[PDB]
Design a protein around this ligand. Structure first.
Ligand code: E9U
Ligand code: E9U
Ligand code: E9U
Ligand code: E9U
Lengths: 387, 387, 387, 388
């Protein structure tokens, strides 16, 4: 037996201190490391390049994703930035999803306008749209599945093998499910990346990113570029993230129980026009999600009856969903993407993503199921009183 | 509606930052707080007396335990110390259990030798022993249930009512189960205390204590003595401890799933002489534990067949159980009470308690059941190979 | 040759990490440490008993003070508390100074009322008072020099030799000057203790304490009691405190430059009635301070002309002196001891000490002399404009 | 009056907590902040974009440098990365110094090979080399003065006014002196940047960067680009960095006293061929440094008599100088740039910078001067023993 995912996350850095046998791993804040006398670099020399505390988190995310190594960055956007710098140069074309996170769109459109690469935004749920993009010989394809905030599911085996036939690398943003629930590298992706800010840290008190490469040579290109660009993260942040990771399995058990229950409430409720949640049998992509994921996760969005006034009445009064950005915390959250998470997009790119001005997104926490439903039901009455 | 205990713990100090609306509470390390002009103390003035980060943890443990307030100490022994100093003076008698934590035994016995109080050490699970202790008019009775490390169960309602009949205060050490699995104040106790070092924190990276009093007058007295003796904990530690608390309900589900599966493997295994786990119907205290606890927890101890050779072969080779003191963490631990946790006791006090030299204690973490069971089976073999 | 005090403090735990050669020492938060197989304790086992980050700070304060070792407590009051429990039992007598810190007065008086020891409160600067206290065969004499807040100076060599003649142990509270400015163990004292909250830390972001013993056997006793009472500090706090120590010598140069410039402005200013600063030749204790101290420090207090209205006009408007408790930070502070630092005292104990109701105490930080002097001059006019 | 530099750094974030009046500022680790009800962003929304604890450090460095605002990044190299991204695009030319930090060189050469900008590497101490480079109409000139590790001084008024005449922006890497000792924005620079890893933090336990812009609009472009690229720093690092900043003045007083003493020992010692230290009267740029800086700093390098054997003997046995990378700490350090800090450069870029294979670089700490000199003298004995 190698261990399971859960054991590996729990034991990450446990009993791995050669100095004192501390059970919990020491925080190495040091910027620098001594040489072992003249000409003799130790394993570490300088934290920007390499840090033992940061590398425990890289090693654990690599073990969980099945890759050769991991690079930990100061932010999620910083992981995406790392991949774009290590892989693309001018004259290269990048294919991105139409409904990627608004911050990814912002970065892709900014760097493309400078000429750092050419940009094709496509619908990867959609074989025609994918084949028109792959006919242009892209260096790189990015997949974000399930997608933020409409939970569109893209067929990892389909898109990754279509892109291999034309010689493109693949990178998957696996933020929304974590490595506990989806392993894109199992499907042949070259790279998997995360905002550790979300479920991997789980406590809404670190911003971070990670990139795991399947192949040892691409891992070393990422290490080199991270060091050179100074995109690497703080050892203290890596300490809190590794601490968070140890409860990832236990947290997701509750996130998913709570989300199955809230999906049941919102599906078919009189005051709800549409629910987007991969666990619903009627959601386009349900069968795909069931085969490529080990769970349906705990992100969902939904559209209320009754326009702006219903949205305002629903949101103002929530006791247990904080109105705020981010997701993946132990604490439940709610967001209005048009005006918050996806406000960096133009009204046109939103229209093309199918993100309406009335869409609410839930990040379902690990509070008691009974309390989240009392809160959501009172919300739905407040919105009904509006008609 | 009030929220459940689990909701309260997940959301303690969420969106309670008047400065910026931070979702996660800011860490207030400051030793000191400005006055609001001459004569105008704010809410806080000095961190030894009171600090807001520490008070979030205080207010959270008091909500969970049903008390008027909570005091956070540098350590668990510190929380016991605070209670002895606030409640007892020379000529007062204290009744303690015979099978309490060895460190509790060391402190009671050192402060009794100096004459801070008179000490009676009784078996609180046996009525004759209890009645003889209560007939000597004690100021304070301490209960520790379940007991470390034999998991003896003492009848909270019985002992507390019996102690009120003679004017004694009662304090319960509730470390082994946390507030999520046992609420002694519900049964009339005046004081409950914890080593927060264990389940409450959950990440083996903070030593700390807490005392919660039912009554506001007794809470104001503990606040005064904690400030005067200098027993209060660090704000950074409260911060990590509070972060720990948010996953307590989530952690204990997996803890209890794993402990049930491990009790079943150990009980009537040929190499296992006795299992002490209150979840087994054959354990003296099982039905009392099913009544006064929400669950049977994840601490257990066992005797192997085959003397000291068998213990050694069992322990050397464990991959997933670290040989170490402490308990209540996400990572699985094993200890040998006689030489480790209860080394502070004399050989006669261990014999009176029923702690043999062949006893092993397990703290069962939240790794996969299957990896822990493979690890224990390999150990039982190595013990068998010794005969 | 050995290095100086300053070199030792700057380099405490620099290049002393066997794991990675980290230049700065790693933070060991871990509550627990693995055994090296069955029966083999490593150097550390449990953080309440010993922790390597806390021991760098202990070992550093013991080098600076000339001691056999040091113990780091959660607070300064906790270090006094540790010494009272390690050294005293009922029937023993303790001699304390009349103008000790009000928090010391609160603890001595509360533990004396319970009868943990008998208390003699003497004026240690006056030989009759000292002789009458030493004629009563005390187990322990506590000296606080200079005294908070009137900067009375007690003759370390005289009092210590007098206490040895009658078999008493001596403990000195060396908080106001730190080890960089006064070394009581050089004059034969048994114990020196500190509030690390002040100059040692220097950044007003840690409450902590330290006790250093001259003799190895008394150090082993303080280690034992600190573990058994649970009085030990947080490793995170020891890390910030060690980081503070590194600039102690550099900080005190500027503190003393600023204090000299400010004592000169206040002494025979028309609005100032008395200055208490041991650096002035007119201060009872100046020549003793010049002999037993490397410098006059940066604490001072003063009485304004014009009663309560003048104090209020002086305090309300200060830009660079914050109205707060504590002292010894980089930032300048002002306090009113009667209502703030020494409110724990009765009005009668304050009168016996010579703490009037019109007294102000300054902690002078490391801001520019010119910005502090402009700030004080403006206060002196506001106080003038009151008459 | 407004306050001095020392007062500003000491009082940064002091008594600035509206929640409890904490004297020392709270650490806001929170990734997110609540909205004030539907449609109502508060001052902060998301730490990657902006965080109050990080903003105290940005504000304080902006006050110290005289600029409109500051952006704090996860590293020093990340600050340089932020500037190249916010200011340059393909077809733009960037002028850099020949003797810049080998990490800067690595990044300039890597991004120039991809085509992100055209690169001109010039000697900015040398007026013909500067004027050949400004004839090429560059978007941006970077100055690193004093330079790492030969302490070459570049004339801020000269180079910045030459670059304004041809329409180029100026950015100055001011790591080596800190804002306490050189204010490039006083000389007209558009941008100053720092590795806060060095003197600003001072305690070797944070990697960090900062960029301060003179102009509000360029600060707003930096905030935007830092958010979009995800270059922003951790709030906990910004907390430790602000804590170190509070002792910057007091640390530099001892750094400079110790460096004057060590310069005096090495200058004209029989075992020392060359010392590079701006505070020596015989160092090229001494009068320029005396004028454009408020002190000569505590960085120096030097070349020993006696080849590789002398270097190996000097270094092995130092009790108080740790052999390691970085600088600006309270703890004294020694580095061999060819094989450590400048190993990222090619042997030709080093030869062009004048960084020989025998150069040792001292970062002088705040230990007792008497101890640092006992250590250096024993080292010079050890290298002497190597001839005979
Ligand atoms: C699939 C995916 N990949 C990557 C990322 C980036 O990870 P980070 O860098 O944040 O750690 C995210 C983040 N998502 C957050 C972002 C909040 S909006 C940002 C802010 N106002 C801004 O203007 O930017 C969310 O949707 O709630 C992400 O959902
Ligand atoms: C029921 C109870 N109440 C209180 C406490 C005290 O709480 P803390 O102070 O540790 O946070 C504990 C601790 N128990 C731990 C620690 C053993 S450490 C031995 C050490 N070498 C020493 O000499 O002490 C255990 O059995 O593993 C406790 O089980
Ligand atoms: C010479 C000495 N020894 C010991 C100590 C104790 O050290 P700490 O425990 O604080 O670290 C001090 C502290 N002195 C501070 C604290 C005043 S706090 C009043 C507070 N509300 C309370 O009720 O206490 C001062 O005068 O400013 C001390 O001057
Ligand atoms: C003037 C200047 N600007 C910027 C920076 C960059 O700042 P940081 O990102 O490190 O904070 C520096 C750094 N200087 C360090 C770097 C050590 S080498 C690093 C490593 N092995 C690698 O391969 O990179 C030094 O010379 O000792 C710098 O001197």
């Amino acid at each position: 037996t190698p261990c399971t995912a859960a054991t590996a996350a729990v034991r990450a850095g446990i009993d791995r201190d050669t100095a004192y046998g501390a059970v919990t791993p020491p925080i190495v804040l040091s910027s620098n490391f001594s040489f072992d006398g003249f000409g003799n670099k130790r394993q570490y020399d300088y934290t920007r390049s390499g840090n033992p505390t940061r590398d425990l988190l890289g090693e654990a995310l690599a073990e969980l994703e099945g890759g050769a190594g991991g690079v930990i960055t100061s932010t999620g956007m910083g992981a995406i930035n790392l991949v774009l710098n290590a892989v693309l140069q001018p004259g290269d074309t990048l294919v991105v999803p139409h409904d990627a996170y608004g911050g990814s769109w912002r970065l892709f459109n900014a760097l493309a306008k400078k000429g750092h690469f050419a940009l094709i935004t496509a619908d990867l749920t959609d074989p025609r749209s994918l084949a028109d993009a792959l006919a242009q010989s892209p260096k790189l394809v990015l997949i974000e599945t399930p997608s933020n905030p409409l939970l569109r599911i893209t067929d990892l085996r389909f898109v990754i093998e279509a892109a291999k036939k034309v010689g493109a690398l693949t990178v998957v943003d696996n933020t929304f499910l974590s490595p506990a629930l989806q392993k894109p590298l199992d499907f042949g992706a070259d790279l998997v990346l995360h905002s550790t800010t979300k479920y991997i840290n789980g406590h809404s008190d670190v911003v971070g990113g990670a990139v795991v490469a399947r192949d040892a040579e691409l891992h070393q290109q990422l290490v080199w570029w991270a060091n050179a660009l100074g995109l690497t993260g703080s050892p203290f942040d890596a300490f809190l993230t590794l601490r968070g990771l140890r409860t990832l399995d236990a947290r997701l058990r509750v996130h998913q129980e709570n989300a199955d229950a809230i999906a049941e409430l919102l599906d078919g409720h009189a005051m709800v026009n549409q629910v987007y949640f991969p666990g619903l049998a009627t959601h386009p992509g349900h069968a795909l999600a069931a085969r490529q994921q080990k769970g349906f996760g705990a992100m969902m969005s939904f559209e209320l009856e009754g326009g702006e006034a219903a949205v305002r009445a629903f949101v103002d009064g929530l006791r247990y969903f904080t109105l705020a950005e981010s997701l993946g915390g132990v604490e439940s959250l709610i967001a209005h993407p048009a005006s918050m998470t996806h406000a960096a997009m133009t009204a046109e790119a939103r229209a093309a993503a199918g993100i309406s001005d009335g869409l609410l997104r839930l990040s379902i926490g690990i509070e008691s199921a009974e309390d989240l439903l009392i809160d959501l039901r009172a919300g739905l009455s407040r919105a009904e009183a509006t008609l």
